[PDB]
Curated annotation (Swiss-Prot), chain C:
Organism: Mus musculus
Function: Functions as a component of the nuclear pore complex (NPC). NPC components, collectively referred to as nucleoporins (NUPs), can play the role of both NPC structural components and of docking or interaction partners for transiently associated nuclear transport factors. May play a role in the association of MAD1 with the NPC.
Protein name: Nucleoporin NUP35
Residues of the full protein shown: 170 to 249 of 325
Record-stated family: Belongs to the Nup35 family.
Localization terms from the record: Nucleus, Nuclear pore complex; Nucleus membrane
Length: 81, 79, 80, 79
């Protein structure tokens, strides 16, 4: 159940990627993160399942302005390696 | 009311493409597109249709735009 | 695939999204190109039969008193 | 009546410019604008002129206005 510390944040334009990443740094310790070249999403790996849930609780909220953000349990196995 | 749904996470340029995508899940009686941007509200005809859209939450659409779908909560929009 | 393309015209920008949704019910819209300047959009359906259905809507009224025009698409750049 | 045509597809603010434009196809004996719809009905002198109007269906007028032209079917207007 190690995969339970990974979330997938999405919905932001590429220019706001780092901003959103900072915002999610507030929910815990990001041990690792993988941005995406193509899509509007990133994968964040927290230190504890408790921090991932805090991140998840943010699904649907509006960030830094006019950016509704989606947060889902990560399911990309290749990325979680 | 359980017929309204909010779709989000797409850049303004893909807005009508996403609406086209969501049109195929039921009959859209009304749609409102945020100007501030990033989301839009859609009101299907039946609750079973909204729940159909609702289930696409987290799916990746076309040009690889992950989309979020949640029950609509902006009361003033729903009138 | 020219015969699956159609161009819809005669509506104000404000009603563009609403018109695309109206035509979305005649077939499967595989591609659409709207003009930022003109009062027309280009729509590509999956089959010629759908386009023919969109075509039968030439000169009819859509809700708010918006008489729409529909003609086979002749813009070769858009279709390519 | 084969001399009546109804032109459509233009915003309220272009009504006069479009009428002016269709005045170059024949003598417009009578014209009726709609206070609600994006169309006007134009009665020409000859059917020969009216057919010339109809030949303009689908063409882009002036700026960015594609225009539709069809035979008038409004019986009330053709009073």
């Amino acid at each position: 159940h190690l995969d339970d510390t990974w979330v997938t944040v999405f919905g932001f334009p590429q220019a706001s990627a780092s901003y959103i990443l900072l915002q999610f740094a507030q929910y815990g310790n990001i041990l690792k993160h993988v941005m995406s070249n193509t899509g509007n999403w990133m994968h964040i790996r927290y230190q504890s399942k408790l921090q991932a849930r805090k991140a998840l609780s943010k699904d649907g909220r509006i960030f830094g302005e006019s950016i509704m953000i989606g947060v889902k349990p990560c399911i990309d196995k290749n990325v979680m390696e």
